[PDB]
């Protein structure tokens, strides 16, 4: 069904920044549309006052995955939301394993 409640939609950079800063919880992430690359999502986690943005796009093979630095190995998935459950692995996902979702609906 692809249920993405963490996708508030399209918001400016200033919006995503204050959005994660409001929660005041390290590890808080959100799903916002890329204001530079259409059809591509962006998962941001607030850490050290700096909002770390990560581009998430589906490969031509149909597998879901995120961008990887030149020299790092990235695993492939079969769902957009599945990326969250797989990224919840400490020292095996991102700067911080997603923990507190910041959706625009209910607190």
């Amino acid at each position: 069904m692809d249920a993405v409640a963490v996708y508030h939609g399209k918001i400016s950079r200033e919006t995503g920044e204050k959005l994660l800063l409001a929660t005041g919880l390290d590890g808080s992430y959100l799903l916002r549309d890329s204001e530079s690359v259409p059809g591509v999502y962006c998962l941001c986690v607030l850490y050290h006052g700096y909002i770390y943005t990560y581009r998430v796009s589906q490969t031509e093979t149909g597998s879901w995955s995120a961008e990887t630095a030149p020299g790092v190995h990235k695993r492939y998935f079969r769902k957009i939301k599945n990326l969250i459950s797989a990224f919840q692995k400490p020292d095996q996902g991102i700067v911080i394993p997603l923990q507190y979702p910041v959706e625009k609906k209910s607190s």
Partner: peptide
């Protein structure tokens, strides 16, 4: 300062 975004990539 005046910039709360890194736009980095996954280092893991």
């Amino acid at each position: 300062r005046k910039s709360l975004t890194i736009y980095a990539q996954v280092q893991k």
